[PDB]
Amino acid sequence: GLPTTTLPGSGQFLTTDDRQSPSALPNYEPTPRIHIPGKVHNLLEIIQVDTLIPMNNTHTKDEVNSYLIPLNANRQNEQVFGTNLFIGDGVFKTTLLGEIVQYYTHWSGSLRFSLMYTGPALSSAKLILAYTPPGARGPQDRREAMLGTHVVWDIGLQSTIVMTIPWTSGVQFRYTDPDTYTSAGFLSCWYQTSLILPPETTGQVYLLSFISACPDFKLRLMKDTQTISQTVALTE
């Protein structure tokens, strides 16, 4: 008989442990694995695939239309859309990125925001996208917007433009749930010159917008998502 002493914590059950436990049904024998395409190893692998952002959130019931950012022909100087960058809330929240970020407490890294244009091929347009780093207000006019991170996008044969929100930060991690100290800025978009439709054409054209994370990205300290809850256990 070897002398032992038990410490504080004996008998506790910590749902975040990784120890051994006996095998209820020994000498069993699993079924062999066959090959299946698509294996995922890290959630970091999947948040780099871009998905659509319901940017046009202004509706009243969920609709395919809140994915469409409208553009008006012949407007000059004006603003196309605006949003803050609380990736865990608001427009971002239902996107795959938003949806995964919510399983973690802290995030750090660059984001990739792209816009794909869908107007007739014989039209043309020049837009400016601007990222405003924390510390200033959402820009109120392009002059204000153009003094921060921006890209003049020229609509052409190449249909999409990929803007990166480079990680601009004092503190090396931000909270995924919106927090002030930790806030990330604003994203706005304005006409640089203006949309022009060809003859025989009319109305609004739309941009689709996507979001995905750069390879830069870090997420840490897992927790429970506000995105799902329940009141009684389900049954069959």
């Binding site: 008998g11 059950f13 749902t15 990784d18 436990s21 006996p22 209820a24 699993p30 079924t31 694995r33 299946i36 698509g38 995922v40 890290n42 959630l43 970091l44 871009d50 940017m55 959130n57 202004t58 509706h59 009243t60 969920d62 809140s66 196309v80 859309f81 605006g82 949003t83 803050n84 239902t94 949806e99 973690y104 990739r112 792209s114 794909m116 207000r137 959402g138 991170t149 890209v151 190449q158 249909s159 433009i161 990929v162 803007m163 990166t164 480079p166 990680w167 996507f210 830069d216 870090k218 997420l219 897992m222 429970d224 998502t225 799902i228 329940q230 256990a233 389900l234 049954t235 069959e236």
Partner: protein
């Protein structure tokens, strides 16, 4: 590892930021393709986002309850919670489901942890000390009929004996007929015109039968069982879109009617911040 390299002014014919998303690719664009950057290192590995880590902590998967009381004159033990089942799931308690359903196919060893606590809601002189028995009476296995049937001999059938207030742990390999468990299944068990749909067809693995071994004392004792499940040795294939609407049933994808808009409406314009 560098998180960003140093990059300076650019005036090229080589534009990495113009792409065609119609192709289905997400081109790997970085901050340094469109602003001037400085070197910085990652200092991070992505350890805690590994799927083994993501699915590897214990989650509550089931709460049931049984009572110790005089069975004298009870015509239906099962019905008096003199014992009680649990049609093995993992999709009843939605918190771990969304997690799991982020994947199509998924393979993982298992580690079950059962906590049992007792309650004595009405006048008792004391708290008795009960031993719970937990058993696996699967497909072919004689189901318990009374709380003290021959079934409970369970001599070929695994079964646990632990004390109420304590905890019963153990683990299990992948006992799923195929190479992975289907998180989803767009099929039927056969080409029948009325047979059921979903995965409720596949997820066949009998139920768990709990009972108190003790005979009855003078008062009644409620024992409530909580089953926790931790995946170990995880393997997951084919990522899918996360669950947006609420769940209604074990094993079907169905959402409730007149549900509410899941996308938050802006308080303001598209232009609003």
């Amino acid at each position: 590892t560098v998180a960003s390299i140093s990059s300076g002014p650019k005036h090229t014919q080589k534009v990495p930021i113009l792409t065609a998303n119609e192709t289905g690719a997400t081109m790997p664009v970085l901050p340094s393709d469109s602003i001037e950057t400085r070197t910085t290192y990652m200092h991070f590995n992505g350890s805690e986002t590994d799927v083994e880590c993501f699915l590897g902590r214990a989650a509550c998967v089931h709460v049931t309850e049984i009572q110790n009381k005089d069975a004298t004159g009870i015509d239906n033990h099962r019905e008096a919670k003199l014992f009680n089942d649990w049609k093995i799931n993992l999709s009843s308690l939605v918190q771990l489901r969304k997690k799991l359903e982020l994947f199509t196919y998924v393979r993982f060893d298992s580690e079950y942890t059962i906590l049992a606590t007792a309650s004595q809601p009405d006048s008792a002189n004391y708290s008795s000390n009960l031993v719970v028995q937990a058993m696996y009476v699967p497909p072919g296995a004689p189901n318990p009929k009374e709380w003290d049937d021959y079934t409970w001999q369970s001599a070929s059938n695994p079964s646990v004996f632990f004390k109420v207030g304590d905890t019963s742990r153990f683990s299990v390999p992948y006992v799923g007929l195929a190479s992975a468990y289907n998180c989803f299944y767009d099929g039927y068990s056969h080409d029948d015109a009325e047979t059921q749909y979903g995965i409720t067809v596949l997820n066949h693995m009998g139920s768990m039968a709990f009972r108190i071994v003790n005979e009855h004392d003078e008062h009644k004792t409620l024992v409530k069982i909580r089953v926790y499940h931790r995946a170990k040795h995880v393997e997951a294939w084919i990522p899918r879109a996360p669950r947006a609407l609420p769940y209604t049933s074990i094993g079907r994808t169905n959402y409730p009617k007149n549900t509410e808009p899941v996308i938050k409406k802006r308080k303001g314009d598209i232009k609003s911040y």
